[PDB]
């Protein structure tokens, strides 16, 4: 990510951030997130530094590529938004998804059915996905987190500063991270705007799913 040109932030990537809204923080600020910030607005909303966002994205992707067997990375979302995004990320990268309800004791109770024993976690929200962050602290699990400006950084080893609230922002942030782990692995080249479209990862409200079910004809 650093002092390098091949992994430097490109122009269409900035348009994809600014369009999604990954530069819009909360109204609140976590004390641990004060470095991943530029300034407030009027209306009180904190603006994230998209460079620092990209620096954490590549650091995260670097950590994800360093895991040799991909099938032991846990890609966790509980909140609606990320459910689809993580389910596609694991298709792209050959990781294992946990979309929705996280059973307490998946990482801890060795007799449970959902006893997955990963080497690295990715987390859509530290607040909503707090149980797996806590259970990472019982079986040594590094955690990557998609952290809003008011996301608690307890048990978070790389915090990617985003707007993990908004549906566009999350789908985008997962797509960026999925496309970067593949580029670093060497499954895509960096000269081709990637065939997979960031709209593929977006959560779709069932008002907008029943907008598709009508408007085909």
């Amino acid at each position: 990510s650093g002092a390098l040109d091949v992994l430097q932030m490109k122009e269409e990537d900035v348009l994809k951030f600014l369009a999604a809204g990954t530069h819009l923080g909360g109204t609140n600020l976590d004390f641990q997130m004060e470095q991943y910030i530029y300034k407030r607005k009027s209306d009180g909303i904190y603006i994230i530094n998209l460079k620092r966002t990209w620096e954490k994205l590549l650091l995260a992707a670097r950590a994800i590529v360093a895991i040799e067997n991909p099938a032991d990375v846990s890609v966790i979302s509980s909140r609606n938004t990320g459910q689809r995004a993580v389910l596609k990320f694991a298709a792209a990268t050959g990781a294992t998804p946990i979309a929705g309800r996280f059973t307490p004791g998946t990482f801890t109770n060795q007799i449970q059915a959902a006893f997955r024993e990963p080497r690295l976690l990715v987390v859509t929200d530290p607040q909503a996905d707090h149980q797996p962050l806590m259970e990472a602290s019982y079986v040594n699990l590094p955690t990557i987190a998609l952290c809003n400006t008011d996301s608690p950084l307890h048990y978070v080893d790389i915090a990617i500063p985003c707007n993990n609230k908004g549906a566009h922002s999350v789908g985008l942030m997962w797509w960026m991270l999925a496309q970067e782990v593949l580029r670093m692995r060497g499954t895509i080249s960096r000269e081709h705007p990637w065939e997979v479209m960031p709209d593929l990862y977006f959560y779709r409200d069932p008002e907008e799913i029943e907008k598709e079910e009508q408007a085909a004809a």
Partner: protein, 83 residues
């Protein structure tokens, strides 16, 4: 944050802090070239004056004392002078 540059406080952080609690102790006051338009002479007034600084050869009364910074009378301008 664990790691803070305690020797190198960014000037946004230093001017924020209490004057006594700054890495090196530094006041929040300054001297003003206060000039009234009626008179010719530039008087040196202290920002946190706490007296009635008069025009010597009376054309006016320049500042009036308050809690902190004195009120410079309407008509008067000020340059903050430094070394």
């Amino acid at each position: 944050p664990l790691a803070k540059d305690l020797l190198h406080p960014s000037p946004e952080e230093e001017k924020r802090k209490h004057k006594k609690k700054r890495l090196v102790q530094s006041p929040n006051s300054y001297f003003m070239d206060v000039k009234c338009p009626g008179c010719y002479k530039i008087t040196t007034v202290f920002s946190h004056a706490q007296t009635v600084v008069l025009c010597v050869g009376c054309s006016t009364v320049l500042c009036q004392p308050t809690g902190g910074k004195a009120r410079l009378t309407e008509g008067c301008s000020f340059r903050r002078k430094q070394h």
